[model samples]
Target: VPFVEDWDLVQTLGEYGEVQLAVNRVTEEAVAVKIVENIKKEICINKMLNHENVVKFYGHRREGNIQYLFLEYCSGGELFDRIEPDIGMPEPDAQRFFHQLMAGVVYLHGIGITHRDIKPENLLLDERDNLKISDFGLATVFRYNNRERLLNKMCGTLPYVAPELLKRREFHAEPVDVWSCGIVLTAMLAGELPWDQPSDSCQEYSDWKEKKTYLNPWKKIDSAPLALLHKILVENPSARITIPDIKKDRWYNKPLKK
Candidate 1:
């Protein structure tokens, strides 16, 4: 988080430690300044990458011991807080946001990037109420020709972590993110966590994995949506649903946006 700037931290914007509602001195426009470590190389070089559903990067500057990454200020706050009050948000609202996320996920994977962590918190809303994917700090890339790779590292927030990643196996990164997407949808619909154990650590999920059974949450969803969830949330990375299949799935194929 080495930013050498005179931006004023105007407000507290999020639960995360590094986020701030900052004011850039030069432009006098409001923006989100995220204090980041690791200092991703691709993020620096590819600042021009754009997608409507993806947060816009205003670029970065380095200071003594940190990196100052400037980002588009999302006014509506996190997608997480917005969905409170039900088992999840209503299906109609959930579908619209889900589809927007899917669209963004499709574009990201198409271009070889895998957003290693995809969760409601990282999904921000603009003044127009658009769902935009943020936080590329954990993202990775694999060219289409080289295809899927076995990722050795295990990372992501606890609840949204994919089963393969928990196994500490060489998992396919793209499918892992897709699994997280299913979990995001699960939270949106159920209002509570879908299951306590996404890994084999819990007897319930472990048995379901062994017996090839779906959990109670799976039973909770409708047949069509359940089918789609089954594709993404499967235990085996090999059997998991892909971004393309999700785009074609019956539930997701419906008209989601106005």
Candidate 2:
């Protein structure tokens, strides 16, 4: 098991280091400041936490104006790299990965933690292809009574960002994570993003919000399951399928080959 860390000069540490400190100053500060706060919040929520799917954290350090944190390394690299060039993964493979990702998310939620960022890039694999949720920088702790408090942060990647975050700018992190998870599942099975561009003014985002279905090399693959796809990609956050719902889906219940 590996943890996520920040290295002051990640480039100098060589590529084999467990974590690559993000060099982008703005990104580093954003993660180090607001994001790290949430990471600490999650840590408080799950004291003495130990999970196979969650990346472990070693410690943090500061050099000059830069900050660094140590984390476990994932030798297999990102899952996106493997599937992107191919446009999508095979159906069985995608299902397996989705199941594993859901398990991790469910576990996190079970402990009252919400992973605000859920995308292919954040999902890393070990040498044996086991999936682990990395990057707790955007994660937050949620209590049942704080659902209203959970809904206000506008954060996440553009392509896979949930509709509620765009429309309302206020949303519960759990549903937002679920929505992104659905997009990730779609990307994995379809190979490429279903939308053309992620800009707020783009017509593609409009079409996606309206639930217009189309086929692309990444989405039209043979044997790609449609039911789960429909549920996960719903434009309305309220209607979006959840991890527990995904677990109960017949498609997920069927045994996957890989």
Candidate 3:
């Protein structure tokens, strides 16, 4: 262990055979240790992206054939736990959380890193109720000469994939991530998935193709706030809203709900 001195296993935080909630034996500080099977093979990018809204990658350790990653412990658990409350998340809370998410995603893309997988399962909350983005195994980083470039891979959880990716065509990581955020925002605010997985095979896709909106729950949302959501979900990337654009939007620029 480099940054980690000693730790005691507290609990298993995940089912994918990796995360074990642990405590610092000396400081009694809680931390999550993820045990990856290999070292030199996986392109571990945890240390590259760092921000208050992004999970902190403290350090790592190599013992035997496994690599143990030290991460900040999130006590409140997954954002999925907060999704389906009565009428979904209250609109106010949703705006605060989703804004933080947009900030993180924008930072990642600005740094030339694309978290292909953006889902509730990958979002966590700390004791103070702050949301943080996690999991970068499927993340990609690309640059051409001195400029950020488009990534052509079809990756990310279903029901959140961009229309272009579903068509099996090369896609830019930024806009596709924006589509995923739209789905996430809808779920956070309206408490529902916008459509079935691999959307094109379902009726929801047809509805979205025809009317420009897919979910029923969103119909009741106010246009002042919903306008940004609609723009983000646009099927056409050329017409889609960018992160910088969202940063300056009316609804997003409004005061947060605390």
- lDDT, residue 40, candidate 2: 49
Q: Per-residue lDDT for 143-253 in model 2, tens only?
A: 565443556777788777777677775676777788778778778866777664344477766665555556353237433366676777677778778777878888888
**TM-score-sorted candidate list, best first:** 3, 1, 2
Q: Model 1: clashing residue pairs?
A: 1-66, 1-67, 2-66, 2-67, 87-190, 87-191, 88-191, 231-241
Q: What C-alpha lDDT, on a 0 to 100 scale, does residue 183 get in candidate 3?
A: 81
Q: What 10-residue stretch in candidate 1 is worst by lDDT? A: 37-46
Q: Which candidate's TM-score is highest?
A: 3
Q: After superposition, how far is residue 228 of candidate 2 from its true place, in Å?
A: 0.6
What TM-score does model 2 achieve against the real structure? 0.75
TM-scores of the candidates in the order shown = 0.84, 0.75, 0.90
lDDT of 3 by residue, 164-196 (tens): 777645767788888888888878877777687
**Which of the two candidates, 2 or 3, achieves a greater lDDT against the reference?**
3
Q: In candidate 3, how many Å is residue 136 off?
A: 0.6
Badly placed stretches (over 4 Å) of model 1 are 1-7, 15-17, 24-28, 45-48, 144-148, 204-220, 256-258
Better candidate by TM-score, 2 or 3: 3
The true-versus-predicted C-alpha distance at residue 248 of model 1, in Å, is: 1.4
Give lDDT for model 3: 0.78
For model 2, what is the error of residue 255's alpha carbon versus the real structure, in angstroms, after optimal superposition? 2.0
